[PDB]
Amino acid sequence: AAPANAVTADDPTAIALKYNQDATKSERVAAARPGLPPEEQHCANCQFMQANVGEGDWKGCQLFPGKLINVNGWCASWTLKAG
Ligand code: SF4
């Protein structure tokens, strides 16, 4: 069950970025974002994931203020976690 503040499929920015809380149900292959092969990309290894926000599998994303993403998710702004 998603948290009350989870990013939802109906969120305009989620639609624009093609977010899904399950990266296996994402278009990461089509997007081919750089830094890792697409099959390896999900929120947990993204620079925008905020490890100190949320709990468990539901963590912050800088791009979605006030909400939570799933660590196993993906969107088209995926960027390698470099620091
Ligand atoms: S920017 Fe990164 S952490 Fe945020 S939803 Fe997209 S892939 Fe997940």
UniProtKB/Swiss-Prot annotation:
Pfam families xrefs: HIPIP
GO MF, any single term: metal ion binding
Organism superkingdom: Bacteria
Residue positions binding [4Fe-4S] cluster: 43, 46, 61, 75
Keywords, sorted A to Z: 4Fe-4S, Electron transport, Iron, Iron-sulfur, Metal-binding, Transport
Family matches, as SUPFAM superfamilies: HIPIP (high potential iron protein)
Temperature dependence: Thermostable.
Biological process according to GO: aerobic electron transport chain
UniProt function note: Specific class of high-redox-potential 4Fe-4S ferredoxins. Functions in anaerobic electron transport in most purple and in some other photosynthetic bacteria and in at least one genus (Paracoccus) of halophilic, denitrifying bacteria.
Quaternary state and interactors: Homodimer.
Membership in a protein family: Belongs to the high-potential iron-sulfur protein (HiPIP) family.
Name under which the protein is recorded: High-potential iron-sulfur protein
Taxonomic source organism: Thermochromatium tepidum
